[model samples]
Target: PATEGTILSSLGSAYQILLFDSYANNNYNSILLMSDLRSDDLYKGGGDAGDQAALYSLSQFNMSAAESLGGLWSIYFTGLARCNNAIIACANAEGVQERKVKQYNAEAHFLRAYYVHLLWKFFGNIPYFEEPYMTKQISADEIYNEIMADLEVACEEGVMEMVNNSGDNKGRACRAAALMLKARVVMYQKDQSRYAEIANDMATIIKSGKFELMDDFDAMWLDENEFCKESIFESNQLPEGKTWSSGWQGYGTNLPAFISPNELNDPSGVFKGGWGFAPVRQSAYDMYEEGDLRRDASINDWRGASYGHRFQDTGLFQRKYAAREGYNPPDTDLNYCNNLRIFRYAETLLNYVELVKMDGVAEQQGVDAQECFNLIRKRAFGIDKPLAATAENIKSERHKEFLGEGMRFYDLVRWGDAAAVLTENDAAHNSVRTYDDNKKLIPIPLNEIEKTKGTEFELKQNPGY
Candidate 1:
């Protein structure tokens, strides 16, 4: 009934591979180094503030579309291909219920949609092929429309029943997940109409009592607290030695190693620690109110003597992910056993608020949306307050809630204000106009255009590209 490694492992590996590739390539290093917040953790490991400060170094912007984007696109397509195969294979499995098979297919569809959305965001107009474009020509925007269209179809076609019947059901997409992704994708696109359209769906998900914001925001990251009702879809992990725990290290390295006065890996501690990757920058620190719980939950700040380091006036390390357990030698097989919380019920609440508020006429929507925001903030600030939505307030709301999740970059782009904001800040790479293109879009690598040498590959590049 299973495509085995093809569906479960290979396709999943593709996305994982791309994430590591991006990290290694420094494709999105700007987040690590010079943003309003601390740089993505490349400290002590050979990144000077100056080195990290250069926004547009060729090395930073030199991802080959043919090589890089093509690689990622291939991975996305591979996921679809495998999922298609899964549907075929699981069609008549001996004991499996038809409902089960359909659920799996729906989950796969959501995943496929996610891949396409990511591709469009980065490449703009890409060669949109699902089964395969099979030589038909379509612009990037055409691809976007097609992908969005598929999402709508998929949403309807999606099975509402949960897909993870396995002992471990943490990673697969569910109905709520699909809706959440739909909401976020539309929101990022700045299509208010589509965004509003999904508000009711998100509300339905929340009201159903399937999800809720946990009482303590900080509890979201403790190693023991992996799957909250709020967590929709997160990457799955197995017992440490049973499966690789590379993802856990991401947070660990970002904090202790990157922050200082912290251990990198203590093969014995329940939660391992290491280089502070994305520490809280002074700007981020300054932005918080004196008593905001989010500031502490989101960042770890040790003023006088950080982690025991001397005179560390102010440095902040991220506390978003589960902290490491006892020591783990470089290759120890200790499983962190924590899933990466990619989509949460809380986000849906936030989305609901944003969409409802944007719809502008529905009094219930505004009231409900404001309630959702306060729900999250009260957890962070220990005080309940209603927020008025100005353009900037909305952006900050997202930043406050979705830190370190790679959501901020997209927010900046959709607003059409990347250039002004990034250039003015340290993370803005102004050197390569292609990558810089107003700090909104990363250029489709040059190699990608060259791949379609005889054929036309929108050499027109993004605005300034």
Candidate 2:
């Protein structure tokens, strides 16, 4: 069953499968649950009882191991198995061109490493295996090194670099995507020793001149702007014309329906009403400064509308991923086809500025971190403050720039401001938000531990779980 042609098809399938979220399968998209929901930026609203309860419990640090956690673990493992089979198929397939095989292998490596990174970020120690059934318990350091090495091979020159903007090449991993993701991994690791290396990689991406911030901040979130030049790695969602299904054939993305506010249907009857979820926090709305254009773009105060409410709802909603009226309408409200923006040029610029700042004064030789930082501010506001680069400034800028984009939690953790910031923010809002060193990594799902019971491969839970 594993032919060269079939292997190529599987690798292609792997790309699409990895994009599947809880709406599509057992896997929860980090953007929805772990990133936005757990952070101060978003809160659960009127939605499924189980989903809302789980997310709300998690937001307040009350959940030990959620049911959704098992879903996330299963999705990645499934993707990993597909990748391993594809790699083996490539090796066994006879008469396939070597260059094409290399490209396929590189893609698999990038995806495999990405899956590993997600697991590693949430659960401290996991049984990782590049080959089938060769799992071994490893430390975070070992896993990090392994993931970096895999990314190195994937980001190697000519492996994925040759992929281009042509019709056939779009939506696939390319040089920028690999490099940007690698930079993210490096920064997440918090290795000050490698800050210069990360900065250099980001500089290389900037020098390539292939990506830039779109002229309009609002346009970046529009359906028409999907896969624009700013996107470094964006999921390719199928339009509403595609058939919606429970399985792989489904083209619509359910995020818009989840994040959209209820009773806010378009006046023209184009956009359908959505299950209200991810109600924006009142604190998040007040965090904006006067004359800042991103405030209106990011959040909408639906005070006058009869909208659904959930825990501590101030009648505010994040409009970044809100339902798009007059766009292509799916057959069902459950299937809105909005592409979830993952890695983009704005994030890359912010990452570079942070890395350069961390690398200290000397590493700014080839890269202009100040200019990169100023460019983002200039775009967000009509004018730039022309502030000098500093860790605090970058942290604040990142907090503002990526509010609804599912990046605030990770940024706070990386900056070592989670405990203090969350405690204070929680108090100000009269919420129960709390954080600790133990809360950084999630617990190992109970199902995985039960599966390994009475076996040599017993799963270890994270401390204080």
Best by TM-score: 2
- Model 2 C-alpha lDDT per residue in residues 1-465, reported as the tens digit of each score: 356779878787678654566344433343444677768777666544355566666676666753436656766777777777777777776677779878888888888787788778777688887666335668777889988987887888877863344488777778777777787777778877767777777787787888888877776788778788888777777644223344345555667766667767445453345667777887788887787678888886677665555445667877767777654453554456577777888887888887767557344447688899999888888787676778878887787888788788877777788898765345443357678877777778787777776777777777777
| Model 2: pairs clashing at backbone N, Cα or C within 3 Å | none
Measured over all alpha carbons after superposition, the RMSD of each candidate to the real structure, in angstroms, is 6.0, 2.8
lDDT string for model 1 (311-425, tens) is: 2123455556434554232423223334456678777776776666644625333347666777877766767755776556766777777665656656666666555544432
Cα lDDT, model 1, residue 70: 42
User: In candidate 2, where is summed lDDT lowest over 10 consecutive residues?
Assistant: 239-248
- Where does candidate 2 stray beyond 4 Å? 1-3, 24-32, 47-51, 66-68, 162-165, 239-249, 266-272, 326-328, 424-430
Best by lDDT: 2
lDDT to native, each model: 0.51, 0.71
